[PDB]
Amino acid sequence: SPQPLEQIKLSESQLSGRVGMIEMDLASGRTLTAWRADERFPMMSTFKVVLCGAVLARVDAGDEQLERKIHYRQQDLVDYSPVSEKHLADGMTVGELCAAAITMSDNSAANLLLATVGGPAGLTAFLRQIGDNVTRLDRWATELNEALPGDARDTTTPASMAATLRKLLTSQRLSARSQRQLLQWMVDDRVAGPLIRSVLPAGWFIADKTGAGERGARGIVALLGPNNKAERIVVIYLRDTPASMAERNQQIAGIGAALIEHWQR
Ligand SMILES: OC[C@H]1O[C@H](O[C@H]2[C@H](O)[C@@H](O)[C@H](OCCCCCCC3CCCCC3)O[C@@H]2CO)[C@H](O)[C@@H](O)[C@@H]1O
Ligand SMILES: *C(=O)/C=C/NCC(O)CC=O
Structure with a gap:
């Protein structure tokens, strides 16, 4: 495979679509590879990880169990x-609802969880609370995947989503137990986890949440190494x-292949 950025560009050319990507060191936040990192993309089902981060914050505060x-x-x-x-x-x-939302994309x-955090507006307020002023949720589970051209609803940017995931998993905003729980839910993804492991070389860790929407929208938020x-x-x-869908899955896998083959940067 070619270098990561070269492969990402080739993917846009072959898909006739926009690709957005960020590769970030989990421990430090250092951005390694970035492409259209500040451009908007529909979150689709990947919003479910942030959703459960908001739930965990309520549990930590004693407002949920x-x-x-x-x-x-x-x-x-x-x-x-x-x-x-x-x-x-x-x-x-x-x-159980969080495990179903994240590991089975239920x-x-x-939606049941979303209501408990105040709906799309409440989840958006939680994002602003943790310092993400870009990501926004506006609709409910089914409708948020519409991906209408130029529609800013239910979008994030690669840079904001990566920073937000790092904040939830490692910044101590969530308790130790909650940080561990959020990570384990991603490790337990049944939709794409097993499939990704089947094509990953031995020795590589994967935890993830994927999403799909209209007009070819597709996405994945993951931990890899x-x-x-x-x-x-x-x-x-x-x-x-x-x-x-198969070619969109293959192009994403191809970017992963490029990262894996050329990991030291
Ligand atoms: O030399 C590096 C490696 O080259 C091949 O590995 C291939 C693998 O056989 C193939 O199946 C995968 O496809 C890519 C699979 C990517 C899986 C998901 C990636 C996700 C994860 C994180 C978010 C974005 C995408 O590429 C690697 C690297 O060329 C060899 O099979 C392997 O033994 C060797 O260690
Ligand atoms: C989470 O992303 C849920 C998405 N549902 C819509 C689809 O799966 C359809 C994709 O073509």
């Missing part, structure tokens, strides 16, 4: 609720490409 059982109804369900549709009778705990679980360590945050978003 991961054990709290939420009983919900069938009319509360939205498109794609693999886990939540199975618990209409017994409900799910707040912690949309109803995400050799020697089985979460060395760097890697955020890649794609938008406005007519390419098949």
